[PDB]
């Protein structure tokens, strides 16, 4: 419930500057010290300014769900999946193209 500016995150009694997309918090700020950020390791990403200690694991494209991987995740963006021909997906979620719908 304490409030922080835009692009800060709350840790104990401190509002800390956020890390940029592609980075995670390596060290939280302190009384005398600003945030330390590190780039996402392989197979992880962050797509937004953030206060996460770790980057998020990259998604996998489930071929049982009718998906193929169309583009590999990068450190600032998750794996892009697509449906097989004859399906459509709705990109409405944080999981984006993840369900292969078909007309009846």
Numbering used by the authors: 39 to 142
From the publication, what sentences describe this entry?
HVEM is a TNF (tumor necrosis factor) receptor contributing to a broad range of immune functions involving diverse cell types. It interacts with a TNF ligand, LIGHT, and immunoglobulin (Ig) superfamily members BTLA and CD160. HVEM engages in bidirectional signaling, serving not only as a receptor but also as a ligand for IgSF receptor signaling. To dissect the molecular basis for multiple functions, we determined crystal structures that reveal the distinct HVEM surfaces that engage LIGHT or BTLA/CD160, including the human HVEM–LIGHT–CD160 ternary complex, with HVEM interacting simultaneously with both binding partners.
